[PDB]
């Protein structure tokens, strides 16, 4: 019932897109911090339906490793989405280029990523753009999956549909997305998590594109793990990566079997 600025002090722009902006807002009376996605509803004709879907999906989310959705408001043709603020920023900025991060930190983060992704898959949601730039850290360095702008429901009441839409970010996309006209959602998300783990352990992406026409991807398929990034990765997490970055999605490891992996369950001294 009050103009936005009267209840909220805007502190900083967290990010911007064709969508609009994401801002850090502090409540003037409670002093609580919130991220606010701001969407100009007049940009593009598909804006109402896309934001309807995103709001619905965000209403489904309730997990400690997924950005929480507090609610939505609209002023004129401006739509606000109020979201949990993650003051630690992007997981991307914890990855030292060509180095990565200490193996116990990468294991902890990977545990939290797996918890969030398997939660999403359990309720039938696929995120479809998992990468370190979309994985945020709260003030205690707990990981949170963020930005469900590309997400959709692939399964409900044990009825699953195959996806066909080309989306994501090439270094993180699974090869079947390039090769097949239709594909299951869950192996695609598992593949992108494996790329994220590679980046955390080695500080670099293994290939620009998951294609035979990419030399580094062919090297991986030829098991040339004396090359970077694999040379930087201890053999236990590398064995996990060998099970995840499997080209054939029907032979790719699932998350239940990732939970049984030896490195995944190894206590790591910091």
């Amino acid at each position: 019932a009050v103009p936005f600025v009267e209840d909220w002090r805007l502190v900083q722009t967290l990010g911007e897109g064709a969508y609009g902006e994401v801002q850090l807002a502090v409540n003037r009376v409670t002093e609580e911090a919130v991220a606010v996605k701001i969407v100009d509803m007049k940009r593009a004709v598909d804006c109402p339906e896309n934001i309807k879907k995103e709001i619905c999906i965000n209403k489904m989310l309730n997990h400690e490793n997924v950005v929480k959705f507090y609610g939505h408001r609209r002023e004129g043709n401006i739509q606000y989405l109020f979201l949990e603020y993650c003051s630690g920023g992007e997981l991307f900025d914890r990855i030292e280029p060509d180095i990565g991060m200490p193996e116990p930190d990468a294991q902890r983060f990977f545990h939290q990523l797996m918890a969030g992704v398997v939660y999403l898959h359990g309720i039938g949601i696929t995120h479809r753009d998992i990468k370190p730039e979309n994985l945020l850290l709260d003030e205690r360095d707990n990981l949170k999956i963020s930005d469900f702008g590309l997400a959709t429901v692939f399964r409900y009441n044990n009825r699953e549909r195959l996806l066909n839409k080309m989306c994501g970010t090439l270094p993180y996309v699974a090869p079947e997305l390039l090769k097949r006209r239709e594909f299951h959602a869950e192996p695609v998300d598992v593949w992108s998590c494996g790329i994220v783990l590679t980046a955390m352990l080695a500080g670099e992406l293994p290939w620009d594109q998951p294609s035979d026409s990419c030399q580094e991807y062919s090297d991986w398929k030829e098991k040339k793990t004396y090359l970077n990034p694999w040379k930087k990765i201890d053999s236990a997490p590398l064995a996990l990566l060998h099970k995840i970055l499997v080209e054939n999605p029907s032979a790719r490891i699932t998350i239940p079997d990732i939970k049984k992996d030896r490195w995944y369950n190894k206590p790591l001294k910091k």
Binding site: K52, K53, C56, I57, G124, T152, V153, F154, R155, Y156, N157, R159, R161
Partner: peptide, 10 residues
């Protein structure tokens, strides 16, 4: 908005 149709599953 429509989970019974898997959103854009239409």
């Amino acid at each position: 908005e429509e989970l019974l149709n898997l959103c854009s599953g239409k």
